Amino acid sequence: MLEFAPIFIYLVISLLVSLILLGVPFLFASNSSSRFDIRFYLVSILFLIFDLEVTFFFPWAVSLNKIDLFGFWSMMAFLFILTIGFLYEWKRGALD
Amino acid sequence: AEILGIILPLLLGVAFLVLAERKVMAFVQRRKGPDVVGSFGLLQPLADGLKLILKEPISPSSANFFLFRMAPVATFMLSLVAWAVVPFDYGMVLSDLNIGLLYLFAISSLGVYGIIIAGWSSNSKYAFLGALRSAAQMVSYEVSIGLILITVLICVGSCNLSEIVMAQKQIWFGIPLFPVLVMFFISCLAETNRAPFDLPEAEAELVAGYNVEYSSMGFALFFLGEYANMILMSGLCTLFFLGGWLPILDLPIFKKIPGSIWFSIKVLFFLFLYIWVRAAFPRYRYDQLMGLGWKVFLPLSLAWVVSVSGLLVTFQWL
Amino acid sequence: MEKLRMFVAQEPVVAASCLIGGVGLFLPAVVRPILDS
Amino acid sequence: RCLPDGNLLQTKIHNIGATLVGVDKFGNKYYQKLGDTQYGRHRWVEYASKDRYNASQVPAEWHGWLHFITDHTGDELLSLKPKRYGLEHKENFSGEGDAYIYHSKGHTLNPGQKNWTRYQSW
Amino acid sequence: SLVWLEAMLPLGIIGGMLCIMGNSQYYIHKAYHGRPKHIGHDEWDVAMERRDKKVVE
Amino acid sequence: AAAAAAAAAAAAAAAAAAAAAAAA
Amino acid sequence: AEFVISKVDDLMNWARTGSIWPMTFGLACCAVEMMHTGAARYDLDRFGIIFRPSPRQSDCMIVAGTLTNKMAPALRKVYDQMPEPRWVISMGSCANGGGYYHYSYSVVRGCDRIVPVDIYVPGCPPTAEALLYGLLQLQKKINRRKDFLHWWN
Amino acid sequence: FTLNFGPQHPAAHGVLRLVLEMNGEVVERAEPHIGLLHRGTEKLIEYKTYLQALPYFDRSDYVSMMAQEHAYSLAVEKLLNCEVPLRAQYIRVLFCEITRILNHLLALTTHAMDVGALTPFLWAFEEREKLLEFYERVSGARMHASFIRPGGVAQDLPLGLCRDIDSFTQQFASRIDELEEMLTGNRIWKQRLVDIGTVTAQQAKDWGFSGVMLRGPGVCWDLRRAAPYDVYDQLDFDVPVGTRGDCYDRYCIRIEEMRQSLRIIVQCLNQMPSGMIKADDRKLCPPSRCRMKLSMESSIHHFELYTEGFSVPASSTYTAVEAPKGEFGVFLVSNGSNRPYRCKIRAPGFAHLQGLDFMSKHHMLADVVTIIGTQDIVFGEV
Amino acid sequence: FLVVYIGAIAVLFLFVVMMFHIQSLRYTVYAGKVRSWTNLETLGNLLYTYYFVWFLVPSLILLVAMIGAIVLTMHRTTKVKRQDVFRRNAIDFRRTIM
Amino acid sequence: PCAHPEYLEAVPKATEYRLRCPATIDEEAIVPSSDPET
Amino acid sequence: VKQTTGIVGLDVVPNARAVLIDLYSKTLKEIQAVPEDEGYRKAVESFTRQRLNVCKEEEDWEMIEKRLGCGQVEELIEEARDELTLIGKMIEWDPWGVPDDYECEVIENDAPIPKHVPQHR
Amino acid sequence: DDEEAEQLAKEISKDWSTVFERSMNTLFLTEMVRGLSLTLKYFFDPKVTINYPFEKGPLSPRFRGEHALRRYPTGEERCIACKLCEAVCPAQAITIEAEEREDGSRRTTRYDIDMTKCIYCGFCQEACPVDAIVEGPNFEFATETHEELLYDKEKLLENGDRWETEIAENLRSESLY
Ligand code: SF4
Ligand code: SF4
Ligand code: SF4
C-alpha cells in the first residue's frame, strides 16, 4: 500500500492541472475578439460477466506455479463453463 | 510535486502528437503535413492551442459548470493518472504498485464513466447515443485487453509493471506471443477510438458526438485526452509485449544503453503504428466492430490464456 | 470432414481458437503425463 | 535565414543544389533545381521580403517562367515588355488601406466619384 | 532518402517528452531521497528501512 | 431487428467483361 | 510601452493565422477545386488549415459553388454557430458574386447576401493555388487585426 | 424516428440533405432533398445561344467535366448534321475518357474517404492533379474546360500533349493498382461494401440507373457499345459488368472501368489522325483567329457565330453519352432560333439518388454514406 | 471494487437512470516477511486449488447470470421471436372466412 | 512482397515530364482549318 | 445445368422449358380475347407460336436459346410473363378498334444524322 | 437462394491446404499487411507537394485567369467597341458603352468586366476580333471586398499593360492554334 500515496496525491495534482487547463480559456478572449436499445444492456451485462471472470483470472494468473496442474485444471473447468456461457450467447445472438 | 514532471511533459507529448499524427499520416499520403507554422510545423501545436484559447465562446453558459465542465476534467485526469504506474526505466515508475496492472484496468473502468457522463450531459439524443455506443465499444474491447493482460501476466510472475518489463530480459513477449501483440494493438486501437475502429469517430459524428457546449476547451481536452489515452495504450503495448525499457541486449560499443530512451523508441514505434494504421485502413462501422470484439478478439484471447497457460504448465516454465 | 472444412473456412477465428486453445487444453492433458521421464 | 517561423525554411532547404536563374527588379530571386527529382518543384522564387511576402509579387516577366508556362526567364522577356505602355507591378494591395486598394468610379471611397445619371439635369 | 525525418521530428519531440517523464520523476525522487527508487519494495524492505534509520541512531 | 443483415460472404472475384472481347 | 501590446497582437495574430480551420461549405465544383487545394500537391494542412466537418469549431468557412436560394438559410444557420473570431472566404464566381447564375431565380447573387465575406477567391473555377492564395490573403487579414490594441482602445 | 442526415464531410458531398426515417440503426427509408444545388440551369440555357450554353455542361457534373460538353456537342450535332473530323472525334474521346478517369479517381476515393480510407483520396487526387495538367493545358481551366464545342473541339492539342498523356498512361496502371491493393483486398473494405446497396437488375432498370449502377447488376449496357457515338466503334475496350450488384461490385467496376479507360486513352493516343480540329462548316465552327483577320467572309462568320450563333434547325433529339456517372443525356428541343428551347438535361444522380430510398433500406445508418458513395452522387446534376 | 462496481454495476445503474428515468511496542517478526505474498498470490494459492468448488460454483452463477440476461433482455430481438411471423396456407381461410 | 512486380517501377514522380514548357514555341504548330480540296 | 444468369435477380430456372411451354400456352389461350384484326394479336400470336414451337422441338435450354435467338430462357420467361400481364391488362381498358375521326399526324421528318452523335448500334 | 449460394461459395474453398491458406490470410491479417506495406512505401517516398507562395503549380499559355484589356504596342487601347465579348459573354459580366472619341476612332467609354459575375471561360478572348480582351495568367487577385472584384471600366483591365510581357508571350505561342 505504501506506494499508493504518490497516486493519492496524483489525483489531486491532476485535478489542479485540469482546473488550470479549464481556467486558461475562460480568462482570455475578452470583450473585443430511439425508445431503448436493449443491446446496450446486453453488451453491458456481458461486459460485467466477462470482467468478473477476468477478476477470477487475475489471482490464477499471478499464482500458477503454486497451483501445479490442479489449479490450472480447475481454472480450465471454470473457463469451460465461461465458454459454454459464451457459446450460448454467440448462438443465441447477443454479440451483434 | 514530481507529478508536474509527468503531466507537463505528457501535455507537451499530446500537443506534439496531434502534429505527429497530422504529419505522419500526411507523409503517408504523399504530402508534407503542418510545415509553415514552425520550422517544420513544430510550432503548429502551439498555434492550434493558442487559437482554441483565443476563440470567443459561442454562448457563455457558465451556469451549468458542475455537470459537464468537470467531466472532461475527469476523463483527462484518468488518462493522466494511469501514467503513474507506467515505468519508463528501472526505478522510474512514479509509484510501483504491486497490483499495477489491475490498477490500469480500474482506470479504464473509470474512463467508461468519463465517456458516459460527458455524453449524457450533452442534451443531444444523437450525441448521447453516440457516446453510449463509444462507451460500449471501449468496454467491449476491455474484456479482450483484460484477457490479453492475463496472458502476459501468466508469462510474468506478478502484476507489477516493473516486473512485467523485468520479466522480458530473456525475450520480449512480443516474439513468442506476437499473435497476442497484434490482438492487444488491435484492441488498444479499439479501446481508444482512434483506429480503423472509429465509426463514432467518423470525422463528422465525432465532433457532434461528445458534447454540445464546446467553448474550445472541451474540444481540446477531449483530443488531448484521446491523444494521452493513445500515448498510454501505446505505452502498454511496449511494457507488456515489447521490452518496457530493455534493449536487444547485444550490448553495443556505440550504444551506452539508456533505458528511458528505449522505452521512448518503442512507444514511438507504437504511436507511428497508430498513425500508419489510421491512414491505411477503412473504418469498421461499429456493427462489425462490436461483432469483432466479441466474436473475434474474445475467443482468440481466451484461447491464448489457455495456450500460454497450458504450454507453461506442462513444461514447468512458470 | 467436409463440414469441418466448411466450418474452418466460414469461421476461421472460432475454428482457430478451438485449436490455439486445444494446444493449451491438450498439452497438459497428455504431454504433461508423457513428461514422467 | 533566421526564420524558423515560416515555410520559407522549406524554400531555404531547397536552394541547396539549385541554380539561381536571374533576379527581377523587386529582389525576388528565381531559382531552378532541375535534373535531381520531383518535377513541379524545380522552379520557385525567393521573395526577398522574408516577412510580408505573398503571391502576385512575381512580376509578369517571370510569372510565366515560374508557373512553367514558358521556358523564358524574365531576363529574356524583359526585351519584350512594351516600353511605351509598360507598367511596374503592384503586389495586389487588397485590403491594405484605401488609395492602395482598387475602387470603382462610384464607390464614394474613390476620389472623383462619378455620377452615372445619363440625363444631364438642369 | 531522408525525407521522413521531417515527419520523424514530431515523434522525436514526443519521445523526448517521455524520456523527460521518466527521468524527471527519477531525478526528482533521487533528490528527495539519496538513493534511486526501489521497484520490488516489499514489506521486508520497509521493515529493514525502519530498523536501518533506527540503527544509524 | 429482423432487418436483412449485410452478409459479407459472396462469390469470389472473377472479372466479368462483356462478350465483345475478340470479335464483338 | 505599447511595444508589449504590439507583440501580444503579433502573437495572437500568429496563432489565428497559423491554425485557421475552415468549415468548408463545399457546394459544387469549387469544392472539388477546394479538395485539390486540400490534396497532396497544394497542402492546406501545411498552412494549418484543417478542413473541419462541423461549424462548431472552425475559424473560417470557405463557401464554394452556387449558393442556392434554398441553401441560403442553411449557410446562414451554419455561419451563426461559428466562434466569434470567424471569417468567411467566398470561393468561385457563383459563391463570391452572382456568377454564371447571377440571373438565375434560385441562385443568391453572391454569398455576400447571407454571410459577411472577408476574402473572395476570384475565378469561377479558381486554380487550386488561387484558393490557396485567397487563404494566404485571409492570413494577411488576420495579421492586420491587432485586437489587443483595440481592446485597450 | 426521423434523422436529418446532412453532409457528413462537406466539400466531398456538398449539399446532401437526406432525411432518414430510421429504426434504431436500421434505416427504414431515406428521403433525399434536392434543390439545395438547383441552379437555374434548365432555364438559363433557354436564354443564351448554343455556344454560351456549353459552359453550363462542364458545370453540370463537377467531377467529370468534359463528358457533359461531349453530350451537349453531340446534341447540337445531332440537329446540325455537323460532321466533325476524325481528329476532333479522337481528341473528344481521349478527353471524355480522361474524364472518366478523372471521375472514377474521385468517385472511388471520395467514396473511399467517406468509408474511412484517407490515403486513397490523396493519391487519386495527385493523379487528378496530373490529369488537370492536361485539361488546363489543352483548353485553359483545370476544371471547367469549355473545350468540346459543338462543331468538333475548341482548339487543337498543344504540341506536347500526347507525349505527356503517354508518359502519364504508362504510370497509371500502377496508380490504379495501388488504389486497388489498398482497398480491394482489405477485409475492412469488403465488409464495408459487400452486400451493400445490392440492386437486382430489374430495380436498376426500373429506376433508370443506366450507369456503373446498371452494370453492377449485370445488365450489359454501355452506351459506348450500345450506341457508339465516336471512334468508340473503332476503339477496343471491354465493359466490366458486375455479377452481384453490391457496392463492392460497383467499386470493382469503377476500378476496372478506370483501366479500360486507360486502354481507350492509349488507343486514342496511338491512332490520332492529323486532320482538321473543327468541322469545316464555318457557319457552325468559328474560323481561326488567323483566317477571320485575313478573310472578310470568315470575319463575318466569326461575328455571327460569337454573337448570333448557329440557329440549329427546328427539331428535338435526346443525345445520351456514357458519362462517368451514367447515361448523361441532354434532351434538346430546338426552336429554329439561335437559342435552344428547353435544353432538358437528363443527369444520372437524379435517377441514381432516387435509388437511395430502396438501396439503403434496412442498411445501417453508416451505410447510407457508402450508398451515396457508389452512386457517384454529384449534386450539380441533381 | 472499482472495476466490478463503478465500472460495471453502477454503470448499469447509470443506464437505468439515464434511460428509463424514474420521475513503540510492536515486535515485528522478520519471519514471514522474507517472501511477502501479494494479495493476488495469496488469494490464488487458495481459490483455485483448495476451495476450488466455491470457485466453480460462482462459475455456475456467472453462467446463470449470462443465461438470465439473455432470456430476460433479449426482448424478442433475435430467434426468441425473430424466427418468423409464421403462417400456414391450408388452414388459412383466404377470404372463405373473415 | 507487394504490388511491385518490376512494373510499379513506373513511379508517379516523373522528374522529366513536360520537358518543353508549353508557351515555348520550339515547333510552330499548323492546325489545319480546312481540307485541301475545300 | 445453367450456373447463373449474369443478370442479378433473374434467378436461373432449372425447369425453363416446362414453364416456358406453360406460359406460351397460357398466352395463346388468353390472346383470343382481343379482336382478331388488331396488330397486337397478330404479333402476339406469331411470336408466341414461334417460341412455343421452338421450345417444344428443342429439349435443352441451351438449344432453346441457340435456335430461338432471344437471349436467355430466364429473360424469355420474364418476357412471356410480362406479355401475359399485358394481355390480361389489354382486356381491360380495351383500346382496340380505330375511332371514327382518328386524326393521326405522321410528322415523318428525315433529317440526316451525322453518326458521330450516339443514335444506337 | 442466398442460403444455397453461401453453402456453395463455401464448398468451393473446402480442400485442406486451401482452408489453411484462407485461414492464415484472415488470421494473420495478410491482405491488410499489404496495405500497410504500400502505405509505408509511400511514407518514405518523396512527397508530391508544393510550398505554394514560393513555387506554384504548372500552367499553360491557354490558362484563363485575370481578364486584361490588351493595348497596341503604340499605346491606343486595342479595344474597338464592337461589343462581341459583351455579346458572347455567357454570364454577361462585360458591360460596354461606346463613344466616338475626339480623335474620331471608336473606343469604349465603359468597359467593366464583373469578375464575380464572370465564368472565366475565355469566350471573350476568342470573340474579340483584335485580341483586345485576353485572360492574363494572373489568377491571384483575391480581393478583401466585393466592389474591388468588379473590374472597373477600362482602368483596372488596363493593368494588363503590366501583364503584357506575359500576355504577349502567351499569345505569340498560342496564336499557332
Ligand atoms: S463559380 Fe464556377 S467553378 Fe465555382 S461553383 Fe460556380 S460554376 Fe463552379
Ligand atoms: S470568360 Fe469572358 S466571356 Fe466568359 S463570362 Fe468571363 S468575361 Fe464573359
Ligand atoms: S474587347 Fe474585343 S469584343 Fe470586346 S469591345 Fe473590345 S474588341 Fe470588341
PDB file of C-alpha atoms in Angstrom, chain B residues 2 5-6 9-10 12-13 16-17 19-20 23-24 27 32 35 40 42 83 88 90-94 96 162 231 260-261 263-264 267-268 271, chain E residues 3-29 32 36-42:
ATOM      1  CA  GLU B   2       7.049  15.476  -9.254  1.00  0.00           C
ATOM      2  CA  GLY B   5       7.355  16.208 -14.210  1.00  0.00           C
ATOM      3  CA  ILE B   6       4.934  13.598 -15.563  1.00  0.00           C
ATOM      4  CA  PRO B   9       5.894  16.543 -20.424  1.00  0.00           C
ATOM      5  CA  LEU B  10       2.823  14.442 -21.182  1.00  0.00           C
ATOM      6  CA  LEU B  12       3.663  18.526 -24.474  1.00  0.00           C
ATOM      7  CA  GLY B  13       3.638  14.956 -25.750  1.00  0.00           C
ATOM      8  CA  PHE B  16       3.023  17.342 -30.308  1.00  0.00           C
ATOM      9  CA  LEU B  17       1.195  14.099 -31.028  1.00  0.00           C
ATOM     10  CA  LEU B  19       1.203  17.285 -35.043  1.00  0.00           C
ATOM     11  CA  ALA B  20       2.921  13.896 -35.213  1.00  0.00           C
ATOM     12  CA  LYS B  23       2.462  14.945 -40.184  1.00  0.00           C
ATOM     13  CA  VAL B  24       2.983  11.171 -40.351  1.00  0.00           C
ATOM     14  CA  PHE B  27       3.694  11.849 -45.279  1.00  0.00           C
ATOM     15  CA  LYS B  32       4.060  17.351 -46.087  1.00  0.00           C
ATOM     16  CA  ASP B  35       5.028  22.766 -42.315  1.00  0.00           C
ATOM     17  CA  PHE B  40       8.830  22.041 -39.520  1.00  0.00           C
ATOM     18  CA  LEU B  42       6.985  22.305 -34.663  1.00  0.00           C
ATOM     19  CA  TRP B  83       0.593   7.171 -16.159  1.00  0.00           C
ATOM     20  CA  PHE B  88       9.839   4.304 -18.101  1.00  0.00           C
ATOM     21  CA  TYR B  90      14.257   0.691 -13.851  1.00  0.00           C
ATOM     22  CA  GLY B  91      13.057   2.631 -10.843  1.00  0.00           C
ATOM     23  CA  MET B  92      11.455   5.414 -12.857  1.00  0.00           C
ATOM     24  CA  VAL B  93       7.837   4.472 -12.210  1.00  0.00           C
ATOM     25  CA  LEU B  94       6.265   7.181 -10.077  1.00  0.00           C
ATOM     26  CA  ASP B  96       5.412   0.988  -8.073  1.00  0.00           C
ATOM     27  CA  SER B 162       8.199  -3.051 -13.439  1.00  0.00           C
ATOM     28  CA  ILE B 231       0.234   7.545 -25.655  1.00  0.00           C
ATOM     29  CA  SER B 260      14.013   5.622 -20.925  1.00  0.00           C
ATOM     30  CA  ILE B 261      15.337   6.187 -24.450  1.00  0.00           C
ATOM     31  CA  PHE B 263      11.032   2.929 -23.809  1.00  0.00           C
ATOM     32  CA  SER B 264      10.659   6.119 -25.827  1.00  0.00           C
ATOM     33  CA  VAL B 267       6.355   3.876 -27.681  1.00  0.00           C
ATOM     34  CA  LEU B 268       7.249   5.937 -30.748  1.00  0.00           C
ATOM     35  CA  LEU B 271       2.454   5.658 -31.936  1.00  0.00           C
TER      36      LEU B 271
ATOM     37  CA  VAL E   3      12.602  12.848 -46.292  1.00  0.00           C
ATOM     38  CA  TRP E   4      10.801  11.006 -43.483  1.00  0.00           C
ATOM     39  CA  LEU E   5      12.913  12.838 -40.893  1.00  0.00           C
ATOM     40  CA  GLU E   6      10.628  15.870 -41.046  1.00  0.00           C
ATOM     41  CA  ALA E   7       7.778  13.575 -40.014  1.00  0.00           C
ATOM     42  CA  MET E   8      10.054  11.803 -37.548  1.00  0.00           C
ATOM     43  CA  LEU E   9      10.754  15.102 -35.756  1.00  0.00           C
ATOM     44  CA  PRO E  10       7.343  15.360 -34.030  1.00  0.00           C
ATOM     45  CA  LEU E  11       7.699  11.765 -32.890  1.00  0.00           C
ATOM     46  CA  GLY E  12      11.148  12.724 -31.625  1.00  0.00           C
ATOM     47  CA  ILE E  13       9.902  15.687 -29.600  1.00  0.00           C
ATOM     48  CA  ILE E  14       7.162  13.390 -28.324  1.00  0.00           C
ATOM     49  CA  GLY E  15       9.828  10.826 -27.467  1.00  0.00           C
ATOM     50  CA  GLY E  16      11.956  13.489 -25.903  1.00  0.00           C
ATOM     51  CA  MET E  17       8.941  14.083 -23.660  1.00  0.00           C
ATOM     52  CA  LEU E  18       8.558  10.523 -22.406  1.00  0.00           C
ATOM     53  CA  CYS E  19      12.277  10.487 -21.671  1.00  0.00           C
ATOM     54  CA  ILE E  20      11.551  13.564 -19.557  1.00  0.00           C
ATOM     55  CA  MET E  21       8.509  11.911 -17.988  1.00  0.00           C
ATOM     56  CA  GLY E  22      10.753   9.037 -16.974  1.00  0.00           C
ATOM     57  CA  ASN E  23      13.891  10.854 -15.882  1.00  0.00           C
ATOM     58  CA  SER E  24      12.197  13.808 -14.178  1.00  0.00           C
ATOM     59  CA  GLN E  25      10.252  11.664 -11.711  1.00  0.00           C
ATOM     60  CA  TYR E  26      13.505   9.726 -11.272  1.00  0.00           C
ATOM     61  CA  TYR E  27      15.967  12.546 -10.604  1.00  0.00           C
ATOM     62  CA  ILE E  28      13.317  14.314  -8.541  1.00  0.00           C
ATOM     63  CA  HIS E  29      12.906  11.210  -6.391  1.00  0.00           C
ATOM     64  CA  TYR E  32      14.408  13.903  -2.091  1.00  0.00           C
ATOM     65  CA  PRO E  36      17.073   5.613  -6.562  1.00  0.00           C
ATOM     66  CA  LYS E  37      13.587   4.214  -6.222  1.00  0.00           C
ATOM     67  CA  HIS E  38      13.189   0.554  -5.294  1.00  0.00           C
ATOM     68  CA  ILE E  39      10.686  -1.210  -7.528  1.00  0.00           C
ATOM     69  CA  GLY E  40      10.264  -4.553  -5.776  1.00  0.00           C
ATOM     70  CA  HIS E  41       9.779  -2.818  -2.430  1.00  0.00           C
ATOM     71  CA  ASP E  42       8.009  -5.457  -0.365  1.00  0.00           C
TER      72      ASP E  42
END
